[PDB]
Design a binder for this molecule. Structure first.
Ligand SMILES: *[C@@H]1O[C@H](CO)[C@@H](O[C@@H]2O[C@H](CO)[C@@H](O[C@@H]3O[C@H](CO)[C@@H](O)[C@H](O[C@H]4O[C@H](CO)[C@@H](O)[C@H](O)[C@@H]4O[C@H]4O[C@H](CO)[C@@H](O)[C@H](O)[C@@H]4O)[C@@H]3O)[C@H](O)[C@H]2NC(C)=O)[C@H](O)[C@H]1NC(C)=O
Ligand SMILES: *[C@@H]1O[C@H](CO)[C@@H](O[C@@H]2O[C@H](CO)[C@@H](O)[C@H](O)[C@H]2NC(C)=O)[C@H](O)[C@H]1NC(C)=O
Ligand SMILES: *[C@@H]1O[C@H](CO)[C@@H](O[C@@H]2O[C@H](CO)[C@@H](O)[C@H](O)[C@H]2NC(C)=O)[C@H](O)[C@H]1NC(C)=O
Ligand SMILES: *[C@@H]1O[C@H](CO)[C@@H](O[C@@H]2O[C@H](CO)[C@@H](O)[C@H](O)[C@H]2NC(C)=O)[C@H](O)[C@H]1NC(C)=O
Ligand SMILES: *[C@@H]1O[C@H](CO)[C@@H](O[C@@H]2O[C@H](CO)[C@@H](O)[C@H](O)[C@H]2NC(C)=O)[C@H](O)[C@H]1NC(C)=O
Ligand SMILES: *[C@@H]1O[C@H](CO)[C@@H](O[C@@H]2O[C@H](CO)[C@@H](O)[C@H](O)[C@H]2NC(C)=O)[C@H](O)[C@H]1NC(C)=O
Ligand SMILES: *[C@@H]1O[C@H](CO)[C@@H](O[C@@H]2O[C@H](CO)[C@@H](O)[C@H](O)[C@H]2NC(C)=O)[C@H](O)[C@H]1NC(C)=O
Ligand SMILES: *[C@@H]1O[C@H](CO)[C@@H](O[C@@H]2O[C@H](CO)[C@@H](O)[C@H](O)[C@H]2NC(C)=O)[C@H](O)[C@H]1NC(C)=O
Ligand SMILES: *[C@@H]1O[C@H](CO)[C@@H](O[C@@H]2O[C@H](CO)[C@@H](O)[C@H](O)[C@H]2NC(C)=O)[C@H](O)[C@H]1NC(C)=O
Ligand SMILES: *[C@@H]1O[C@H](CO)[C@@H](O[C@@H]2O[C@H](CO)[C@@H](O)[C@H](O)[C@H]2NC(C)=O)[C@H](O)[C@H]1NC(C)=O
Ligand SMILES: *[C@@H]1O[C@H](CO)[C@@H](O[C@@H]2O[C@H](CO)[C@@H](O)[C@H](O)[C@H]2NC(C)=O)[C@H](O)[C@H]1NC(C)=O
Ligand SMILES: *[C@@H]1O[C@H](CO)[C@@H](O[C@@H]2O[C@H](CO)[C@@H](O)[C@H](O)[C@H]2NC(C)=O)[C@H](O)[C@H]1NC(C)=O
Ligand SMILES: *[C@@H]1O[C@H](CO)[C@@H](O[C@@H]2O[C@H](CO)[C@@H](O)[C@H](O)[C@H]2NC(C)=O)[C@H](O)[C@H]1NC(C)=O
Ligand SMILES: *[C@@H]1O[C@H](CO)[C@@H](O[C@@H]2O[C@H](CO)[C@@H](O)[C@H](O)[C@H]2NC(C)=O)[C@H](O)[C@H]1NC(C)=O
Ligand SMILES: *[C@@H]1O[C@H](CO)[C@@H](O[C@@H]2O[C@H](CO)[C@@H](O)[C@H](O)[C@H]2NC(C)=O)[C@H](O)[C@H]1NC(C)=O
Ligand SMILES: *[C@@H]1O[C@H](CO)[C@@H](O[C@@H]2O[C@H](CO)[C@@H](O)[C@H](O)[C@H]2NC(C)=O)[C@H](O)[C@H]1NC(C)=O
Ligand SMILES: *[C@@H]1O[C@H](CO)[C@@H](O)[C@H](O)[C@H]1NC(C)=O
Ligand SMILES: *[C@@H]1O[C@H](CO)[C@@H](O)[C@H](O)[C@H]1NC(C)=O
Ligand SMILES: *[C@@H]1O[C@H](CO)[C@@H](O)[C@H](O)[C@H]1NC(C)=O
Ligand SMILES: *[C@@H]1O[C@H](CO)[C@@H](O)[C@H](O)[C@H]1NC(C)=O
Ligand SMILES: *[C@@H]1O[C@H](CO)[C@@H](O)[C@H](O)[C@H]1NC(C)=O
Ligand SMILES: *[C@@H]1O[C@H](CO)[C@@H](O)[C@H](O)[C@H]1NC(C)=O
Ligand SMILES: *[C@@H]1O[C@H](CO)[C@@H](O)[C@H](O)[C@H]1NC(C)=O
Lengths: 131, 448, 133, 131, 53, 42
């Protein structure tokens, strides 16, 4: 049921990947808003926040996952990236621990996702041509 | 059934250590200030702090970038505040100084000089013969007798604007959106290593930019016990930071009833010179209760014996040597810059088994802040008597390299770097960078 | 939405119109929310940063509600009568969006959290459903 | 392609529009990443990059092509814009060559796309209200 | 007859650059995207209260 | 010890210059190339 004790920014950082996946909106909503010497630091901070948010959004967009919290893709998982079982990833791991594992393989996964999304777009265009 | 697929999750609670441009936030309740506060974003009256259950984070009090950034910001604010103030270029002139001997105690004999000089008038073609009282620490004999200001062969001092207050005001260092500040809530944290109790905040607590050399004043106190923190306790070349669990009240005063003279050295420019002290002339000093100081020193020794044997003799000695800015407890008591001789505080030996301590202080008016050269500031005299009360929150000790089977350890005060003052406050904070995008394997597959 | 027989469509044109009538001119406002050392240069830079910030503030909220790229987006969050007990006709025909904003202002944050939670639940349910293939 | 010699920013600038259409992500992923006046000038450059990216995204959104690399539309192709055959466009010229040809008619196409998306949105809304 | 400039006891005057012109040029104050400026078209508006037009 | 091609190129100039003290001046000399000094009108 919906009985969270409390939801806050990064509150699920210590929870398992499965449990932390139910609080995605908690982090997603604090990513945009959580001359004098102090006047320039604030402007730089604002610009930097906008840039980081837009970088993440662009990465989502070119993968076909635009406007989605949990987006499923057509890229099969390579056992080389991580041989751990599904049960021991979503119930015995936190997203922080997982990130430290799939880090040497993140760029490969990103490239595969982009290529797969482009292929999907081309295939959809081809199919719509027949109709 | 056994085939897994990449699933993209947005908003996963992940973060990475990062360095960013933290901005300041100040309380609304808190005319102008050196640490420009009207330019700081108002703080949230009800700060939000999220307890990160199960999270263990690695903090490094000594490689923390929030300290160097604070140092740079403090220096920049100092320079910005001093930019519009008067530049005392004409003050670099020959002075005919004579001793002040009108109702002086023996201790304050020769510490004050009565100097007369020719100074530029508002008109470029007229000069005025004025006089001012200068502390001996500010004048150098040129060789009754001819003197000159100490800075005249290094730079021209910039007078501090009288309407700009040096009083430290709490500054909350906030992080940009997409970044977070993790606070180590562990009460026995020693600055380094994992912190089992962590919470995330958007802004730090109010950190007062108090500037002092040997004693940490008006800082935050330890919750349980005196905490000794050092980058490497074994190394004797690394300073030891001591944080008291209970404050030691220190009363500092400048008894002289000073008089401020406004000498107009140019169009719209005024030089605020000391006039004549109304009454007897007596030394400036600071008082700390003997009993409270001894109790705190005993606690410090007890906590020090943990890292230096259970029976080693712990003795406190005064500063080795150097310039007045490192051998004395320097601070700023509401405009006046003190330099107190903390030789009575650190003088004792502790074996394995009412009154007050008066620290004779000296005042200076030409200040070289931040250990910089070629950039001095002239502190205008403060009219009337001066008296401030502060809390000795901690110490910055140094250890001597006693070899040859040394059963005794000698600790003496040491200041120098001003970062260690900020470090005593930004030791439980670290900036992290959020990574909301994550990829994990799942049985789910996209639909075509 | 395409303005058949509209006298004129302009930014905030239907500000005094009823919510029902003003709902057919969303495109008019939507497309103007992004386009439209010296003292002036700093002001222009600050204005550009402010515009980008304000646009992205609403775009993020749309994104995390599942309404990305939509002007009218239906949701799965039932309307709690406590927020407003007025009839549907009493809202879409005898009220303007400016008046409406003044009524549900107290309950905006509650609704937003409900929308975010509902979108998260929908995403999880869709993931589970697709995992069965 | 399925197996490519190398994919780089603008690498397919010389390839035919058909071949260069399989490397859209390559260009799309490089459109966002790359006190004193130098700081201010840098801030202006970064803000300009953000504004250009957001303008492109808004243009895509108002056409109904939000978060899509290849998006089909309901706007028919007016032969006045270009009389070239489909095979002679997608296999005998590059995007740079194509852009130089339809540069005059670009704003017309953009306006037609916006109005067509407006009509589609009206149809969607009317159908929804009908049910 | 000894005189001095009026400002000599208050500040040092900065001579205005002869090339720079003081002529007022109209300035249009524009609001950023996401903000709007509402103009009261009422011909009898007295600066306060509701503006029907 | 100058060559015939460097006659008049270097000028030995003496002048009064300000000291670190606003009320004291120092008489100093320096060598200036002829291309740097202009006769005012030894
Ligand atoms: C540690 O913290 C403690 C407390 O938190 C600090 O002790 C405080 O120190 C401040 C500053 O020294 C002190 O505030 C002054 O109190 C004086 C006595 O009440 C006031 O007279 C004084 O006001 C004058 O100075 C201000 C400086 O900005 C001016 O703004 C103000 O207008 C006053 O100056 C005008 O008036 C005088 C007199 O009429 C006149 O001569 C001037 O020309 C001018 O016209 C300050 O308000 C606090 O009272 C202290 N609090 C306590 C409890 O002692 C301590 O300093 C901190 N330690 C360190 C190291 O920072
Ligand atoms: C510092 O010296 C000045 C003189 O240079 C003293 O001021 C003079 O004091 C005498 C005797 O009291 C008076 O007759 C003069 O009128 C004063 N003014 C001047 C311009 O001479 C001043 O009292 C001395 N201050 C101290 C503390 O010794
Ligand atoms: C006047 O001031 C001078 C300069 O500070 C001092 O003269 C010194 O007096 C002490 C005491 O005898 C001795 O060190 C020397 O005789 C002096 N020279 C120094 C300090 O370099 C002293 O404060 C005062 N002396 C007189 C005679 O007025
Ligand atoms: C301040 O200025 C006065 C006069 O401008 C100086 O007094 C002169 O001192 C020199 C020293 O040799 C004498 O030759 C002059 O005759 C004096 N002129 C006078 C008294 O009018 C004085 O030395 C300067 N310095 C000070 C006052 O410290
Ligand atoms: C400025 O003057 C001071 C004092 O005259 C100088 O300090 C002395 O410097 C000499 C260097 O030859 C040392 O031997 C002395 O021990 C110093 N004494 C003190 C009290 O500092 C200073 O070096 C000078 N600075 C410059 C840049 O010339
Ligand atoms: C803490 O300091 C001690 C002493 O400075 C370091 O131990 C020294 O390490 C060097 C490096 O090989 C040796 O040459 C010395 O002989 C060691 N001295 C002692 C007394 O052990 C120690 O490595 C430092 N700790 C860290 C983490 O750097
Ligand atoms: C610091 O302590 C000293 C010593 O207790 C104080 O000096 C005494 O002050 C009282 C008046 O308050 C006099 O009756 C005593 O004669 C003084 N004693 C000595 C030895 O001078 C001093 O007032 C204290 N100052 C502060 C700021 O706490
Ligand atoms: C320091 O000296 C000043 C100047 O004498 C004192 O201020 C005067 O105090 C008397 C006391 O009754 C008042 O009548 C005057 O109006 C005050 N202002 C003056 C004379 O300008 C001040 O009280 C002294 N502070 C001390 C001794 O702590
Ligand atoms: C530091 O100063 C404070 C006052 O500013 C002293 O506290 C006072 O102490 C006296 C003497 O016991 C009491 O009569 C007062 O009631 C105290 N007042 C307050 C407000 O505390 C304190 O004792 C001083 N401490 C030292 C070490 O000098
Ligand atoms: C530190 O304390 C000692 C003794 O209490 C002070 O005495 C001087 O110590 C130095 C050794 O560093 C000797 O060379 C001197 O002869 C001692 N006497 C004097 C009058 O200096 C020492 O001055 C104190 N130092 C500081 C910086 O406080
Ligand atoms: C700090 O204070 C101590 C004593 O409180 C000073 O040491 C005394 O210095 C004087 C001369 O300055 C000697 O006559 C005494 O014999 C010294 N006593 C002791 C116990 O050392 C010390 O010099 C001061 N620090 C300075 C002046 O830098
Ligand atoms: C450091 O502490 C020692 C030990 O208490 C002090 O030495 C004694 O000081 C008292 C105070 O006047 C004298 O009566 C004793 O004769 C001293 N005994 C000695 C020197 O063996 C010493 O004065 C302190 N130094 C400081 C405070 O600077
Ligand atoms: C210095 O220490 C004193 C004593 O611990 C602090 O005074 C306390 O202040 C808090 C809140 O202002 C009160 O709730 C306590 O009752 C005070 N204690 C006493 C004994 O009165 C003071 O806040 C500390 N900070 C400064 C700047 O003095
Ligand atoms: C600058 O000088 C002017 C003129 O001398 C001052 O103005 C006069 O100030 C006196 C002060 O008693 C008045 O009585 C006169 O009526 C004023 N006259 C005029 C024309 O202003 C002015 O006050 C001075 N300013 C400063 C800051 O000293
Ligand atoms: C000394 O230097 C002067 C300046 O260069 C030279 O004298 C003459 O300067 C004029 C003007 O430039 C030239 O036309 C002459 O040719 C220079 N020479 C003579 C002899 O007149 C020359 O270099 C030196 N003259 C001396 C030492 O008499
Ligand atoms: C530098 O200054 C000195 C003295 O101020 C000048 O020498 C004087 O020159 C005038 C005429 O120009 C003579 O009436 C004086 O007798 C001279 N006095 C001395 C002491 O020489 C000199 O001309 C100036 N210029 C240079 C380059 O030294
Ligand atoms: C990742 O790469 C780094 C550097 O090549 C290596 O040290 C580390 O062991 C690797 N870890 C994993 C999990 O691939
Ligand atoms: C601080 O504590 C850690 C263990 O958490 C320890 O490894 C380190 O040596 C300590 N540093 C000191 C006592 O200076
Ligand atoms: C502080 O305690 C130590 C150890 O008992 C003692 O030697 C010293 O005299 C005390 N300080 C005093 C009494 O001022
Ligand atoms: C040091 O002495 C204390 C005295 O209470 C004791 O608790 C501690 O165990 C001792 N540590 C040793 C002997 O390592
Ligand atoms: C909204 O809340 C405020 C503060 O509680 C209250 O004064 C006001 O009447 C409320 N308005 C509505 C329409 O609920
Ligand atoms: C194509 O555009 C021309 C104007 O350039 C216009 O005259 C013609 O009617 C258009 N034809 C179609 C089919 O849209
Ligand atoms: C585009 O218009 C220009 C004149 O504005 C003309 O010179 C050029 O030939 C045109 N290009 C075409 C029709 O491809």
């Amino acid at each position: 049921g919906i009985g969270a004790v409390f939801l806050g920014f990064l509150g699920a950082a210590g929870s398992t990947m499965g449990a932390a996946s139910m609080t995605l909106t908690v982090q997603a909503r604090n990513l945009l808003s959580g001359l004098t010497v102090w006047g320039i630091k604030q402007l730089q901070a604002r610009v930097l926040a906008v840039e980081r948010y837009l970088r993440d959004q662009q990465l989502l967009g070119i993968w076909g996952c635009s406007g989605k919290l949990i987006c499923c893709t057509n890229v099969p998982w390579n056992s080389s990236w991580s041989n751990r079982n599904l049960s021991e990833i979503w119930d015995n791991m936190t997203w922080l621990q997982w990130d430290k594992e799939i880090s040497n393989y993140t760029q490969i996964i990103y490239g595969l996702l982009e290529e797969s999304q482009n292929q999907q777009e081309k295939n959809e265009q081809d199919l719509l041509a027949l109709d | 059934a056994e085939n897994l697929w990449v699933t993209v999750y947005y908003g996963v609670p992940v973060w990475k250590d990062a360095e960013t441009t933290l901005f300041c936030a100040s309380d609304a309740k808190a005319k102008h200030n050196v640490w420009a506060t009207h330019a700081c974003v108002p703080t949230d009256p009800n700060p939000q702090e999220i307890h990160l259950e199960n999270v263990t984070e690695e903090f490094n009090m000594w490689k923390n970038n929030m300290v160097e950034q604070m140092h740079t910001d403090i220096i920049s604010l100092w320079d910005q505040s001093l930019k519009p103030c008067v530049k005392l270029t004409p003050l670099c002139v020959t002075l005919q100084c004579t001793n002040v001997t009108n109702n002086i105690t023996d201790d304050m004999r020769g510490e004050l000089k009565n100097c007369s000089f020719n100074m530029t008038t508002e008109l470029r073609d007229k000069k005025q013969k004025v006089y001012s009282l200068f502390y001996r620490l500010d004048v150098v004999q040129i060789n009754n007798k001819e003197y000159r200001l100490i800075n005249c062969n290094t730079s021209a001092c910039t007078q501090a604007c009288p309407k700009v207050s040096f009083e430290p005001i709490p500054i909350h260092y906030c992080a940009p959106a997409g970044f977070a500040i993790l606070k180590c809530k562990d009460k026995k944290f020693n600055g380094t290593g994992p912190c089992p109790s962590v919470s995330t905040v958007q802004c730090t607590h109010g950190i007062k930019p108090v500037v002092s050399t040997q004693l940490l004043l008006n800082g935050s106190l330890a919750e349980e016990e005196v905490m000794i923190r050092s980058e490497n306790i074994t190394n004797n070349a690394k300073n030891i930071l001591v944080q008291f669990n209970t404050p030691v009240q220190i009363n500092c005063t400048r008894p002289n009833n000073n008089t401020r003279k406004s000498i107009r050295i140019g169009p719209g420019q005024a030089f605020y010179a000391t006039g004549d002290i109304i009454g007897d002339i007596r030394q400036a000093h600071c008082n700390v209760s003997k009993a409270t100081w001894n109790e705190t020193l005993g606690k410090v020794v007890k906590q020090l014996r943990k890292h230096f044997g259970n029976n080693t003799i712990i003795r406190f000695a005064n500063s080795s040597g150097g310039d007045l800015e490192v051998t004395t407890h320097s601070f700023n008591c509401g405009g006046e810059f003190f330099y107190c001789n903390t030789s009575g505080l650190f003088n004792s030996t502790w074996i394995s088994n009412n009154d007050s301590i008066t620290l004779p202080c000296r005042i200076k008016q030409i200040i070289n802040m931040w250990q910089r050269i070629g950039q001095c500031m002239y502190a205008p005299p403060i009219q009337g008597v001066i008296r401030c009360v502060s809390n000795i929150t901690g110490l910055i000790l140094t250890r001597d390299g006693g070899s040859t089977n040394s059963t005794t350890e000698t600790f003496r005060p040491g200041g120098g770097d001003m970062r260690d003052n900020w470090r005593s406050e930004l030791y439980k904070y670290k900036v992290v960078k959020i990574e909301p995008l994550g990829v994990a394997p799942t049985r789910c597959k996209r639909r075509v």
